[PDB]
Structure formats: C-alpha cells, structure tokens
C-alpha cells in the first residue's frame, strides 16, 4: 500500500485513490485491512496530490500564449 | 450500559494522533470545535472512570 500511495502522490490514480475532475484526489471508502481512523490523514495527504496533478496538467497544456507564459511554466518545474 | 472495551496500546496510538492535530478519531470525537472524550471506552482495569479522567486532561491539550 506504501508503494501504492507513493504513486498516487506522483500523478497516477488507482482503485484505492480514485480521481474526480472537480474535487480532486480522495480515498474511495472504508477499507477493512487498514484502520478507519487513517481515512482522514490520507485525505489530508491528498490535498497535496491534487496540487501536483493540477500543476503538471497545466504545465503540459501550456495554457493564452506568450513567451513569458512559456518561461513561467519552464521555471515552475524547477521549484 | 454497553461499552466498547478497547485494548491498552490502542489508546496511546490514538493519543499520538490527537497530538498530531488530525481529526475524525474513534476517541476524542469533537462536536463544536471542542474535543470531547467518548462514553463507552473502558479498559480491563482503571474502573471506567479514571480513564475518563486521564483522557480528559489530554483532551484539554
């Protein structure tokens, strides 16, 4: 599940971590193997994944035009 | 009156989460921005009331 999460925080969503076009990354529902108290910290953890996905989607899309927008995304990957 | 009869080590793990600042915990269920201990928690020892006492202090934290 660890390596499962470390991909979800990379930009690849799966069955455990569903993806929604409006809200963002979030856990699907309760899982028997894991505890029912963790279902919160992950949701607190995904508030970060949603940022990286919405980042890289915009970075690729390049969207508006102009060099100063191209370079901004070019630098946005460095930080 | 029924009670959940939680184990002992489980409490410390829950207490650590309260210290962390996470919400939605099986213990210390807040209602109005004020964390508050549940009512059915009991250990084999500690007569069901001292537990409500010791947790009440950590809740204040």
Swiss-Prot record, chain A:
Q: Which domain of life is it from?
A: Eukaryota
Q: Give the location in the cell.
A: Cytoplasm, Cytoskeleton, Microtubule organizing center, Centrosome
Which tissues carry this protein? Answer: Ubiquitously expressed.
Q: Which family does it belong to?
A: Belongs to the TUBGCP family.
Name the associated disease, please.
Microcephaly and chorioretinopathy, autosomal recessive, 3: A disorder characterized by congenital microcephaly and chorioretinal dysplasia associated with poor vision and nystagmus. Variable ocular anomalies include microphthalmia, retinal folding, retinal detachment, optic nerve hypoplasia, absence of retinal vessels, round areas of chorioretinal atrophy, and attenuated electroretinogram. Most patients have mild developmental delay and mild learning difficulties.
* Subunit field text: Component of the gamma-tubulin ring complex (gTuRC) consisting of TUBGCP2, TUBGCP3, TUBGCP4, TUBGCP5 and TUBGCP6 and gamma-tubulin TUBG1 or TUBG2. TUBGCP2, TUBGCP3, TUBGCP4, TUBGCP5 and TUBGCP6 assemble in a 5:5:2:1:1 stoichiometry; each is associated with a gamma-tubulin, thereby arranging 14 gamma-tubulins in a helical manner. Gamma-tubulin at the first position is blocked by TUBGCP3 at the last position, allowing 13 protafilaments to grow into a microtubule.
The task this protein performs is described as: Component of the gamma-tubulin ring complex (gTuRC) which mediates microtubule nucleation. The gTuRC regulates the minus-end nucleation of alpha-beta tubulin heterodimers that grow into microtubule protafilaments, a critical step in centrosome duplication and spindle formation.
Name of protein: Gamma-tubulin complex component 4
Record gene name: TUBGCP4
Q: Parent protein range shown?
A: 1 to 96 of 667
Swiss-Prot record, chain B:
Q: Tell me where it resides.
A: Cytoplasm, Cytoskeleton, Microtubule organizing center, Centrosome
Which tissues is it found in, per the record?
Answer: Widely expressed, with highest levels in heart and skeletal muscle and moderate levels in brain.
Classify the source by domain of life. Answer: Eukaryota
| Subunit organization | Component of the gamma-tubulin ring complex (gTuRC) consisting of TUBGCP2, TUBGCP3, TUBGCP4, TUBGCP5 and TUBGCP6 and gamma-tubulin TUBG1 or TUBG2. TUBGCP2, TUBGCP3, TUBGCP4, TUBGCP5 and TUBGCP6 assemble in a 5:5:2:1:1 stoichiometry; each is associated with a gamma-tubulin, thereby arranging 14 gamma-tubulins in a helical manner. Gamma-tubulin at the first position is blocked by TUBGCP3 at the last position, allowing 13 protafilaments to grow into a microtubule.
Give the family from UniProt. Answer: Belongs to the TUBGCP family.
What role is this protein assigned? Component of the gamma-tubulin ring complex (gTuRC) which mediates microtubule nucleation. The gTuRC regulates the minus-end nucleation of alpha-beta tubulin heterodimers that grow into microtubule protafilaments, a critical step in centrosome duplication and spindle formation.
Q: What is this protein called?
A: Gamma-tubulin complex component 5
Organism of origin: Homo sapiens
């Amino acid at each position: 599940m660890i390596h499962e999460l470390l991909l979800a925080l990379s930009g690849y969503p799966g069955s455990i971590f569903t993806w929604n076009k409006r809200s963002g990354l979030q856990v699907s529902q309760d899982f028997p193997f894991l505890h029912p108290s963790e279902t919160s910290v992950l949701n607190r953890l995904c508030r970060l994944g949603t940022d990286y996905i919405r980042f890289t989607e915009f970075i690729e899309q390049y969207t508006l035009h102009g060099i100063y927008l191209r370079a901004f995304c070019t630098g946005l990957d460095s930080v | 009156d029924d009670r959940v009869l939680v184990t002992e080590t489980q409490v410390i793990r829950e207490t650590l989460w309260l210290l962390s600042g996470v919400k939605k915990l099986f213990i210390f269920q807040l209602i109005d921005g004020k964390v508050t201990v549940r009512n059915n928690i009991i250990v084999t020892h500690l007569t069901h009331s001292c537990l409500r006492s010791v947790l009440e202090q950590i809740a204040a934290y």
